[PDB]
């Protein structure tokens, strides 16, 4: 039932590698479907462009914490849009942030999921019950560690960390 997707990452125009994710479609089908669709770019957004992670960036990276990206509309953390509209409800919190390499939804409080997500670099139990965990890095965790090095304690990312390609795997 679970499906897989991938991201090809570039740092300042230089390819850093590929990350392959397994989506927990069997636990959070709705949340996973949104992410999958955003990887393929098959849906048309509120504007006239397709909702796609391609060319989007990781705007906030904090070492020993997580990598955040997915702001496909404003690229600074204030935007985002899902295939269900501007936002959608928290599906469930069955999965916890108990290991590094987990995919989780970023939000602005209860039921405000859109397209922003985070990739954990360590367990983040304080996020349990507040963020929906819907995936796992099954390949390329080493690429994620390379991205981590581009971050700062403030979350500021100096170089451009971009998803140059993506889709189902």
């Amino acid at each position: 039932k679970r499906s897989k997707v991938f991201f090809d990452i570039s740092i300042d125009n230089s390819n850093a590698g590929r990350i392959i994710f397994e989506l927990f479609s069997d636990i959070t089908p709705r949340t996973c479907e949104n992410f999958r669709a955003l990887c393929t770019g098959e849906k048309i957004g509120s504007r006239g462009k397709n909702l796609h992670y391609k060319n989007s960036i990781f705007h906030r990276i904090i070492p020993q914490f997580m990598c955040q990206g997915g702001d496909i509309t404003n690229g600074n953390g204030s935007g985002g849009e899902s295939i269900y509209g501007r936002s959608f409800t928290d599906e469930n919190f069955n999965m916890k942030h108990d290991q590094p390499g987990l995919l989780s939804m970023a939000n602005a409080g209860p039921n405000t999921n859109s397209s922003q997500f985070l990739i954990t670099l360590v367990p983040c139990p304080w996020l349990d019950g507040k963020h929906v965990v819907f995936g796992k890095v099954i390949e390329g965790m080493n690429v994620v560690r390379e991205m981590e090095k581009e971050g700062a304690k403030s979350g500021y990312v100096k170089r451009s960390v971009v998803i140059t390609d993506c889709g189902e795997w």
Binding site: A106, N107, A108, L118, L127, G155
Partner: peptide, 11 residues
């Protein structure tokens, strides 16, 4: 602190 929000980044 260490949160992952979208728009008002807190402590």
């Amino acid at each position: 602190x260490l949160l992952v929000t979208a728009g008002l980044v807190l402590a």
